[PDB]
Amino acid sequence: DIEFINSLLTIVWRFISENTFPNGFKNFENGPKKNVFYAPNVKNYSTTQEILEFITAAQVANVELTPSNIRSLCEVLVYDDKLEKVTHDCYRVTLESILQMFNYFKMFPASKHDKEVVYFDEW
Amino acid sequence: EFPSIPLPINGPITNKERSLAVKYINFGKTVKDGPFYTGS
Amino acid sequence: VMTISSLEQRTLNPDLFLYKELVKAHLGERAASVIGMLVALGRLSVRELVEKIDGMDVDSVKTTLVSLTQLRCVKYLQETAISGKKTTYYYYNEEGIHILLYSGLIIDEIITQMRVNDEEEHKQLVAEIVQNVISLGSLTVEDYLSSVTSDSMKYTISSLFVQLCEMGYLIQISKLHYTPIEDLWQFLYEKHYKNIPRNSPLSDLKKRSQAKMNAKTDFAKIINKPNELSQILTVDPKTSLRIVKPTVSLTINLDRFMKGRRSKQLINLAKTRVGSVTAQVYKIALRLTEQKSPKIRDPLTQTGLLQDLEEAKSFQDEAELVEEKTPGLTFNAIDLARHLASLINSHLKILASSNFPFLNETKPGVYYVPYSKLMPVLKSSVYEYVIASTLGPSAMRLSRCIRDNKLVSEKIINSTALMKEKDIRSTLASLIRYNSVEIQEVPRTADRSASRAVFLFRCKETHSYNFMRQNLEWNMANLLFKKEKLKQENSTLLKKANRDDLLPSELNQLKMVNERELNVFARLSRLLSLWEVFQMA
């Protein structure tokens, strides 16, 4: 509570997104993700103790050496808003990477008549 | 009014499909000017 | 007092106000009066309508039933009694009301369905006959071609006419679709039960296997005759061009249109988990397998099923056998999904391993799309993105972690992702009101109190899917009612705009209400695209 949970979630999502997907092909669409992974190979893996190594590479100077309980807690945190967690713990960031940058919802809202709110006042 | 509450969106202003509503109102006018109407 | 926020239609009219507002803007006001009594009462004859309207007579009721039969808005059902006196019966038809509901989205997909001949024929050849079929109902060819004079280009309609009925939409007229769903089964349940003579009981019934299996057998060719049929198609005259038979009249089918409409939600799921080019090859592999697909729920289990658990268990198992044994839909090989090499095969393997339940179940190497095992994932992947879009992403994380386990306790949510008692217990009260929490308390007392009790939070399905469906239906009913209310300020403007086909205050009156009349349909199309998923199983 409350900012370091968001900090740890940001860095583990960044590490998953840079581990299972290439780096310089997310912000543009020039043959996306190298035609993603060039009709993808048999690589298709995830961290499996590598995420705790990326944890260990940079920490706060206090008692936050968590592993094997807050690991699973953040895992459950990342299969109820993001990554599907199929077996071999395979993690794909395909929708959260678009939400970080359902589409084309710009130019909202108006200061005018009906829908343009249609919510409670039940309808 | 009484509700002003967080963002019922999927209601923006940029149509991009104005001719689709033209087809809607054209169908409405052709059913309006049909042989059978059963008005009043 | 000062009821301007539209409170007077709160607790008077769900689930029939939509059906009354779709027909009031299309078929006058007298058809709304009978369709508000067919829905609100059930089955009632002609004179039963006359003694219930209080304001129409037999000359007025029977005039409007023809106009509702032309748009197939009323089901016929003639029956009799045990003593005689055969009379006529009428149901309300929801498929015709849905035809009136979409009505331009039908001519949105049918235009963007043909090949290379683009923007020289889809403006007046097909777009003027399909809307005439939707508007005037059952049409034949000889009554339509009498409207044109000096028909030089008279075979140009025939090439687009044999092409359209080749893959779907156009169909032989309703000789079966005016008969209801339940009486088609009930008359078949009896006419193969009364011909079996007296025999051995064998646990006193036994025919509740045999005869009803027989019924299932001659259910199969009742639905299959309004499909791709060789009676109207593949007619080859001598020393002439291929044509279909123009004599009998033909209508549209709202059975291949819905499975062609499900493909848009399939593409919207395909935007998740993969990119764009691979989504494009899944798009073309999905479009090649449209018109042979298992449709949204058959009339076999729509009604008459008394919940026989063996039959209800075996119906979803035999649908898997229909899905596996097709006349060619399972053959999604390389030579069939690249024309209409190994790189697309690798993309298709990524589709097999994408772990959403599509393009799975492939032993030999030829792939198939599991329509039946996808529908809870389709109805749940879009249900979560509406609480997230409207209510909040924290409420979406909560409503997903209710389902991440089964019946989460009190002190288990605040162990996950967020602290206690700040907005965890605040958005629960914002989700009980939408049938998405379903609290269940157990006490240790003897009178079931609330102080000495604990709460149990299980996300009960088929209550969250129906409440949102009724919500979307009543938003649609809201949106067309306000549109026909602002038309009352244009009865002296739009009717008077016919003698000429500048007073600049009318520039802020006539050409200001026009886009105000367009942006309600512009979002009604999105209401339609968001509502369809809860009625495709």
From Swiss-Prot, chain A:
The keyword Amino-acid biosynthesis does not apply. GO terms for biological process: termination of RNA polymerase III transcription; transcription by RNA polymerase III; transcription initiation at RNA polymerase III promoter; tRNA transcription by RNA polymerase III. One of its GO terms (cellular component) is nucleoplasm. Keywords: DNA-directed RNA polymerase, Nucleus, Transcription. The keyword Nucleus applies. It comes from the Eukaryota. It is found in: Nucleus. Changing D1H: Cold-sensitive. Abolishes interaction with BRF1/TDS4. DNA-dependent RNA polymerase catalyzes the transcription of DNA into RNA using the four ribonucleoside triphosphates as substrates. Specific peripheric component of RNA polymerase III which synthesizes small RNAs, such as 5S rRNA and tRNAs. Involved in recruitment of Pol III to the preinitiation complex. Involved in the configuration of an initiation-competent form of RNA polymerase. Component of the RNA polymerase III (Pol III) complex consisting of 17 subunits. Interacts with BRF1/TDS4. Belongs to the eukaryotic RPC34/RPC39 RNA polymerase subunit family. This is DNA-directed RNA polymerase III subunit RPC6. It comes from Saccharomyces cerevisiae (strain ATCC 204508 / S288c). The lineage of its organism: Eukaryota, Fungi, Dikarya, Ascomycota, Saccharomycotina. The gene is RPC34. The chain holds residues 171 to 315 of 317 of the full protein.
From Swiss-Prot, chain B:
Signal peptide: none annotated. This is DNA-directed RNA polymerase III subunit RPC7. It comes from the Eukaryota. DNA-dependent RNA polymerase catalyzes the transcription of DNA into RNA using the four ribonucleoside triphosphates as substrates. Specific peripheric component of RNA polymerase III which synthesizes small RNAs, such as 5S rRNA and tRNAs. C31 is involved in the formation of the initiation complex. The gene is RPC31. It is found in: Nucleus. Belongs to the eukaryotic RPC7 RNA polymerase subunit family. The acidic domain is essential for its function. Component of the RNA polymerase III (Pol III) complex consisting of 17 subunits.
From Swiss-Prot, chain C:
It is found in: Cytoplasm; Nucleus. GO terms for molecular function: single-stranded DNA binding. Pfam families: HTH_9 (PF08221), POLR3C_WHD (PF22536), RNA_pol_Rpc82 (PF05645), RPC3_helical (PF20912). This is DNA-directed RNA polymerase III subunit RPC3. One of its GO terms (biological process) is tRNA transcription by RNA polymerase III. Present with 2520 molecules/cell in log phase SD medium. Keywords: Cytoplasm, DNA-directed RNA polymerase, Nucleus, Phosphoprotein, Transcription, Zinc. Residues 472-493 are annotated as: Leucine-zipper. The gene is RPC82. DNA-dependent RNA polymerase catalyzes the transcription of DNA into RNA using the four ribonucleoside triphosphates as substrates. Specific core component of RNA polymerase III which synthesizes small RNAs, such as 5S rRNA and tRNAs. Disulfide bonds: none annotated. InterPro entries: POLR3C_WHD, RNA_pol_III_RPC82-rel_HTH, RNA_pol_III_Rpc82_C, RPC3, WH-like_DNA-bd_sf. The lineage of its organism: Eukaryota, Fungi, Dikarya, Ascomycota, Saccharomycotina. Belongs to the eukaryotic RPC3/POLR3C RNA polymerase subunit family. Component of the RNA polymerase III (Pol III) complex consisting of 17 subunits.
